[PDB]
Design a protein around this ligand. Structure first.
Ligand SMILES: *[C@@H]1O[C@H](CO)[C@@H](O[C@@H]2O[C@H](CO)[C@@H](O[C@@H]3O[C@H](CO)[C@@H](O)[C@H](O)[C@@H]3O)[C@H](O)[C@H]2NC(C)=O)[C@H](O)[C@H]1NC(C)=O
Ligand SMILES: *[C@@H]1O[C@H](CO)[C@@H](O[C@@H]2O[C@H](CO)[C@@H](O[C@@H]3O[C@H](CO)[C@@H](O)[C@H](O)[C@@H]3O)[C@H](O)[C@H]2NC(C)=O)[C@H](O)[C@H]1NC(C)=O
Ligand SMILES: *[C@@H]1O[C@H](CO)[C@@H](O[C@@H]2O[C@H](CO)[C@@H](O)[C@H](O)[C@H]2NC(C)=O)[C@H](O)[C@H]1NC(C)=O
Ligand SMILES: COCCOc1nc(N)c2[nH]c(=O)n(Cc3cccnc3)c2n1
Ligand SMILES: COCCOc1nc(N)c2[nH]c(=O)n(Cc3cccnc3)c2n1
Ligand SMILES: *[C@@H]1O[C@H](CO)[C@@H](O)[C@H](O)[C@H]1NC(C)=O
Ligand SMILES: *[C@@H]1O[C@H](CO)[C@@H](O)[C@H](O)[C@H]1NC(C)=O
Ligand SMILES: *[C@@H]1O[C@H](CO)[C@@H](O)[C@H](O)[C@H]1NC(C)=O
Ligand SMILES: *[C@@H]1O[C@H](CO)[C@@H](O)[C@H](O)[C@H]1NC(C)=O
Ligand SMILES: *[C@@H]1O[C@H](CO)[C@@H](O)[C@H](O)[C@H]1NC(C)=O
Ligand SMILES: *[C@@H]1O[C@H](CO)[C@@H](O)[C@H](O)[C@H]1NC(C)=O
Ligand SMILES: *[C@@H]1O[C@H](CO)[C@@H](O)[C@H](O)[C@H]1NC(C)=O
Ligand SMILES: *[C@@H]1O[C@H](CO)[C@@H](O)[C@H](O)[C@H]1NC(C)=O
Ligand SMILES: *[C@@H]1O[C@H](CO)[C@@H](O)[C@H](O)[C@H]1NC(C)=O
Ligand SMILES: *[C@@H]1O[C@H](CO)[C@@H](O)[C@H](O)[C@H]1NC(C)=O
Ligand SMILES: *[C@@H]1O[C@H](CO)[C@@H](O)[C@H](O)[C@H]1NC(C)=O
Lengths: 772, 772
């Protein structure tokens, strides 16, 4: 099927449309650029390898290169592996790039470079040197970069990669770079805005530096600028989870009132962590087009009650005023200026970390006529009291977020508090209007709590204290609710009428409600499913369920059930027939996850008792030691079977004789030592087979007939114990010459023996000695 | 040191005191009795093996045998392994035991025997045949057993091991067994008390059977009987987690009022799950000696309010009235008869599962003058209200257990609800008075809640909802408290004055309080430790701690700190110096557990920052990929180092050069392929080394000097990848001939190669071919 075996340890791809030949050698444990890279190669990635030098030899033949990604072949000591520390900085010999006449992008981040590589081609539009040790920019070193448009110089002098001096930039160093659009000098220990900058800039990044003061003419020429970020100059250092040095005298970043006058094109201004106490209106006099403004992590509590600057921002889309609270203060209420009412275009308003006791309807009144408001985020406020019915005046919003509060009767997990949330390394919103009440102190709920909230489509109660015997009378107003997250509560299923009032509920998550399921001889009515007539998906993961008062769960509607991390091993105790039909009457059930249920065996009757339309079944992570494959005959619509992370030692004698329907078979991380003689014979329906991370030594043609193999979308064999004797000749040949996709042929499909070939990739194996 | 190597795959022991020669071959995957068992052998255990027959060959030479334990060499289908099902019942050929003239004990449980083995010696005092398929007892088959004293016949016909008929016992079958003390017929599908039974019985077990009626003369002769168990005849089957058939018409076990009249010696009567509605006083008329009475899992709610029978039990020590609640009733209060006051000797009273709303002081007044009462257990009652101050009238008690209740302002997990709680397979109490409030609905605490409980030594608040910013004012009355379990709450460490009122606190568990540590940019004062002047032990496991407002924890008292399952990897982010002395000022700290903290490496500064008296350090389960062993020089009092379950690939060149103090080194479950040339040279302090579950191939003499080996209490090498070539000659000899204790030389110290010796124990290896 292939005349010449692909032997290069890099994935290769044609996007013939854009004459792109893409060679990806990301993380292949290489110490040399591999031989025999295609001449027509356009994009070459050599990221995360241990290649110690670049020379004219490196790219000699590859003249059609438009991109070289050579990131992290020597990452700074503190950012990189400590088990494989890079010994010495990447060596770049002269004339290494001057050849590459079509080169448009060059990434040399995280290689401990001391200086900007010279002799670069004039075609270059983008050059990235983040996380090197370049902390002085001279005009002379930048002349090569005439046609440059995007320049990343950040992370060259900061706490993870220290240089122990101030960043230095020569006067007018970037001025003659007349096509420069994006300049990033973030995380560099910079002390003044470099001037003069080319007027051609669209984006300027100066955050996480030691800039104390903005000169009034620092941004005078930048009349094309759209994004400016001055964040984390004079940072607010309270509970900073990085080392943090504030400007002395508790001073803020000092910004002349007329500093932004030139920036008529500005769309995004970021002044996060600048220790601001006031926001002068005068800043925003000649910027009417500002859309995104970040004023998070300042000291603007008082200002939020005033905020005259808001009158000048009628086009603003996003406003962030999060974490402005005064240290040592627990305000009684949120004091929002009337000025908020002048934010005609506002779609998103975030004010986390204001920190106040009580939210009352009136206090949100400035927001009442903001027609386009879509998100209100009042998370992490330690609010103790909130009549949720106030949100009746907010039907128009997509999300009301009261997450992480103390109420009782998306973003990255570390978003506001991480150092560089945009650092490069080496959900129920879609159902409609969402009230996120997660991680609060709600211990008791009743119908009136939700009075006037009929419009809600998703309600997130995850992470509360609800410890109550729901009888179908608690959620009565929520006649439109489609999704309920009840995870991390203490559901008590005394009554099978639980949740039945939610007449349109499509998704119910009662995962991690193990409290009442963890105790012996308490009633649990798992048959509560019957009343929920439109329920598509039920999650009851990690409930530690080992007893049930009802013998059968029933739904005419339910399609997916996650039952992971329970104790079906106890319910199906060998000899106890009573629960072998627990899922049988879930008639439309298509997907069942019963992984992590300690099922070391399956009692007979388990497969017979499965509902008749089951398609996707997980029995992963069960410590299964044995498995009657023949019983798969009962599962007449089975498509996907996940037996990953078990202790199976064998496969069936004939898989076609086990199931006619089975497409996707996952057997990874088992103890399988050898295949049956005619394993896959006549199994024409099979499309995906994972046998990775087993202990297979031989694979003969009888077990792996070609007329089954050649229909496989994918076939995983890596991390086995392959013996490369002459007996293995068919398999070695077949691997080397097959079209079928087999991940990790470079990295992890390898001979353990005999002696001679130990550690050697089978892709590379010369077995001519078997043919003399 | 040893002239003749022990090759036998069984532990062997001399207890010279009791002329015992003890050969334990428990679970050695044997298919034959091994050769070369000592002639002087007295106790031979061959439990859990696959030995398919016994014959006169079996025990030929072993005439001094007093005990043969041969349990579970063929366990019934539903009780045993499904990966290694026993094919065929154990075969006992004639005259197999008749030789063994001193044989006093024979255990043949779980071997699928069809009949009572004949030709047994007349010395036999104990015979166990549990979990075979013997369900008809005939007088003739029992004549061999004249001198028998203890006879276990249970579990031969029940749901896990069915026989599909009634158990049958011939009239007077056991009568001529004139020395019989203990007869167990539990779990046998018995239909009537077998009569007549020898008067010589001390203990009779008939529980879990189909006995519907006791005839009034069924126990007439048994005037030496001490224990009687009739439990689970006519069971209460509500929430039963085994298959359960009740007597028709919900009838009870019917017991003539005079059924116990002969039993003047009875000490323990067990009537668990007999569906009793009334407890006739007349039962206890001629039993003044009764000490333990189990009336759990009946229908005795009403009776508890009356209970005239109690007046006849002034010697009773233990009373169990648990799980007597009426189905579908939630009583308002617990109605305890005054009669309880006549239980002069009572030490333990359990009434779980009465199921009531409100507990008031007066309701316990019958118990007020029970001088010897030590334990009151009112767990699993769904109590919503209890003025804890009522327990001021109970300072004499050791434990007050309100575990698993719904209060707000040891025993097996499956104790009352498992089938046979005495089925054979193949804590802060010691501090003083304990109030267990675990798994309740307490969301808020304040001082007055504990008014008049100054006498408490331990308080268990584990598993509540406490979600509050403890400021030192919540526990003020608990002046004597020594132990607090605050695990599985939601501790908010806003204030470093948390817990400071508990001035005599020696142990504080704040484990699994991860809630407020899981959210970003919240204050956490870990330095709260400073105020607790006598605190010996702090547990703050699984708190998912990745940030702290304080840079140092401090204590002059603290000796043990468990910090397992947190994120020190984030606090010690490479480049962040601020938390490297987090434990330094815990001056008396001797033990630190920082396992499960995702520490793939240890930043420099960590060992320098450890407190000066650290003795016992765990870094287990961290995914450590590297380790600077030299840094152990900073830990000048280190005795135990646990590096188990990591990814270390190398040991130090010389361990003596790394620490002078180190006694116990645990390296198990790592990736170590070889030892350094002089690894253990001059390591005179070393006493315990575990190198098990690594990938070691060779061990040369240089690495393992004899003057270090011969001080080792224990040395673990099992589950490595030992190569048994001629190069391995020293190691093989040394293993075979050393005194040093090396567990699993039989089971798991094994050659992987070469070809010839694959799978072979190194203990057994003959390498004379390397000496010709
Ligand atoms: C960012 O730039 C600043 C300064 O522009 C760097 O701070 C400087 O760092 C060095 C070494 O940390 C300090 O020098 C020291 O002086 C003392 C004498 O008191 C001497 O004992 C030391 O051995 C060393 O020579 C220098 O004073 C300090 N300057 C200031 C104003 O703090 C900083 O390290 C740079 N940041 C990064 C992350 O590279
Ligand atoms: C304990 O003993 C009882 C009675 O001594 C056994 O119950 C009996 O079980 C047998 C076998 O299942 C039943 O006979 C069968 O009847 C069905 C009709 O239902 C027939 O089609 C079968 O071919 C067979 O002949 C019998 O119904 C039943 N008797 C009673 C009174 O329930 C029971 O099996 C024993 N339990 C255990 C765990 O050994
Ligand atoms: C191959 O290299 C080219 C050149 O660096 C990449 O082209 C850029 O793609 C980005 C994002 O997809 C565009 O917005 C830029 O405008 C492109 N620049 C130029 C000059 O062409 C291309 O993405 C690379 N592809 C792969 C798969 O590596
Ligand atoms: C002690 O066991 C009784 C079992 O009944 C049981 N199971 C729950 N999950 C229960 N949850 C619960 O509140 N109760 C109290 C109750 C009991 C009866 C009627 N009404 C309320 C619960 N009782
Ligand atoms: C989001 O920033 C809030 C400051 O940190 C913080 N951390 C807790 N664990 C806190 N827990 C808490 O109740 N608050 C609010 C508060 C503040 C001041 C005085 N009393 C209460 C908390 N505030
Ligand atoms: C709200 O804010 C303004 C300005 O900071 C203040 O003067 C006013 O009194 C505040 N009102 C309340 C109720 O806090
Ligand atoms: C509910 O909130 C939790 C915790 O904040 C979050 O992890 C979960 O995804 C949310 N649920 C949905 C359905 O959005
Ligand atoms: C669930 O099972 C119980 C127990 O028999 C029954 O009373 C109840 O009506 C069932 N509930 C539903 C909603 O099907
Ligand atoms: C050895 O057998 C005797 C008689 O059965 C018994 O009393 C003793 O417990 C046994 N000892 C051990 C430790 O096996
Ligand atoms: C308690 O129960 C007994 C028996 O049911 C009844 O006779 C008695 O009157 C009850 N007493 C109280 C105080 O409820
Ligand atoms: C609880 O009883 C105590 C003393 O036994 C009394 O001081 C107190 O008022 C009672 N408290 C409540 C809340 O019932
Ligand atoms: C407190 O109760 C829990 C379970 O209810 C138990 O695991 C724990 O050990 C108890 N605490 C102590 C200190 O014994
Ligand atoms: C601690 O909290 C209690 C109850 O909320 C309060 O009465 C007390 O004064 C607080 N202590 C301090 C120092 O604020
Ligand atoms: C803990 O740290 C804080 C903040 O530095 C300090 O104010 C507080 O008093 C310290 N507490 C103790 C008990 O040392
Ligand atoms: C060391 O600490 C572990 C962790 O609990 C403990 O189990 C072990 O006994 C300790 N050993 C010594 C000798 O201190
Ligand atoms: C380690 O070895 C060298 C040479 O023996 C010696 O100078 C040094 O003091 C040693 N360190 C310790 C802790 O013994």
């Amino acid at each position: 099927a292939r005349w010449f075996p692909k032997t290069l340890p890099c994935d290769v791809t044609l996007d013939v449309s854009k004459n792109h030949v893409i060679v990806d050698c990301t993380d292949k444990h290489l110490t040399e650029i591999p031989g025999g890279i295609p001449t027509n190669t356009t994009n070459l990635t050599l990221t995360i390898n241990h290649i110690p030098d670049i020379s004219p030899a490196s790219f000699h033949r590859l003249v059609h290169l438009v991109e070289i990604d050579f990131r992290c072949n020597c990452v700074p000591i503190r950012l990189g592996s400590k088990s494989n520390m890079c010994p010495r900085r990447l060596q770049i010999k002269p004339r290494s790039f001057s050849g590459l006449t079509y080169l448009k992008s060059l990434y040399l981040d995280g290689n401990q470079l001391l200086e900007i590589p010279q002799g670069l081609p004039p075609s270059l539009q983008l050059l990235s040197l983040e996380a090197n040790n370049i902390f002085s920019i001279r005009k002379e070193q930048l002349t090569e970069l005439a046609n440059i448009e995007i320049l990343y110089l950040g992370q060259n002098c900061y706490y993870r990669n220290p240089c122990y001096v101030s960043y230095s930039i020569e006067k007018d160093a970037f001025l003659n770079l007349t096509k420069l659009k994006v300049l990033s000098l973030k995380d560099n220990n910079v002390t003044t805005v470099p001037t003069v900058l080319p007027s051609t800039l669209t984006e300027l990044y100066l955050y996480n530096n030691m800039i104390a003061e903005i000169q009034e003419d620092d941004f005078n020429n930048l009349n094309q600028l759209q994004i400016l970020d001055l964040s984390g100059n004079c940072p607010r250092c309270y509970n900073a989870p990085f080392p943090c040095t504030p400007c002395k005298n508790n001073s803020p970043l000092q910004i002349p009132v007329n500093a932004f006058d030139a920036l008529t094109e500005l769309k995004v201004l970021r002044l996060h962590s600048n220790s601001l106490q006031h926001v002068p209106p005068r800043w925003f006099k000649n910027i009417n087009n500002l859309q995104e403004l970040d004023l998070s992590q300042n000291f603007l509590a008082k200002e939020i009650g005033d905020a005259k600057f808001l009158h000048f921002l009628p086009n603003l889309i996003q406003l962030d005023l999060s974490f402005n609270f005064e240290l040592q203060v627990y305000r009684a209420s949120m004091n929002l200026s009337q000025a908020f009412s002048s934010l005609k275009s506002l779609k998103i308003l975030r004010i986390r970390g204001y920190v106040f006791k009580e939210l009352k309807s009136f206090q949100l009144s400035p927001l009442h006529n903001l027609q386009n408001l879509e998100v209100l985020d009042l998370g992490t406020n330690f609010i103790k009291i909130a009549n949720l019915s106030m949100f009746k005046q907010f039907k128009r919003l997509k999300v009301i977020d009261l997450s992480v509060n103390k109420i009782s009767p998306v973003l990255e997990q570390l978003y506001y508090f991480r150092y560089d949330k945009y650092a490069r390394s080496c959900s129920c919103y879609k159902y409609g209007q969402t009230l996120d009440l997660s991680k609060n102190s709600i211990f008791f709920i009743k119908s009136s709590d939700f009075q006037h909230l009929s419009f809600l489509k998703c309600l997130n109660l995850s992470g509360n204290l609800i410890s109550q015997t729901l009888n179908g009378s608690e959620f009565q107003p929520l006649a439109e609710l489609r999704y309920l997250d009840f995870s991390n509560n203490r559901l008590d299923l005394l009554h099978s009428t639980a949740f039945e009032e939610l007449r349109k509920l499509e998704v119910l998550d009662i995962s991690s409600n193990s409290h009442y399921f963890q105790s012996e001889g308490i009633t649990h009515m798992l048959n509560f499913t019957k009343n929920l007539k439109v329920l598509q998906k039920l999650m009851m993961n990690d409930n530690d369920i080992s007893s049930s008062t009802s013998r059968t769960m029933e739904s005419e509607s339910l399609r997916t059930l996650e039952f992971r991390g329970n104790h079906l091993d106890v319910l199906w105790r060998d000899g106890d027939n009573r629960y072998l039909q627990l899922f049988k009457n879930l008639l439309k059930l298509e997907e069942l996850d019963i992984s992590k249920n300690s099922l070391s065996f399956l009692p007979s009757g388990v497969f017979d008792g499965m509902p008749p339309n089951l398609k996707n079944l997980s029995l992963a992570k069960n410590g299964l030691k044995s498995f009657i494959w023949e019983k798969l005959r009962y599962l007449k619509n089975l498509e996907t079977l996940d037996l990953s992370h078990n202790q199976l030692t064998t496969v069936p004698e004939r898989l076609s004789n086990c199931s006619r329907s089975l497409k996707n078979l996952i057997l990874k991380n088992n103890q399988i030592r050898s295949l049956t003689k005619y394993f896959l014979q006549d199994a024409f329906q099979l499309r995906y087979l994972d046998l990775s991370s087993n202990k297979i030594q031989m694979i003969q043609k009888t077990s792996f007939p070609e007329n089954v193999l050649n229909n496989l979308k994918m076939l995983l064999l890596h991390h086995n114990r392959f013996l490369c004797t002459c007996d293995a000749v068919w398999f070695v040949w077949w691997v080397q010459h097959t079209e079928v996709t087999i991940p990790y042929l470079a990295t992890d499909v390898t001979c353990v023996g005999p002696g001679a070939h130990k550690g050697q990739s089978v892709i590379s194996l010369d077995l001519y000695t078997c043919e003399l």
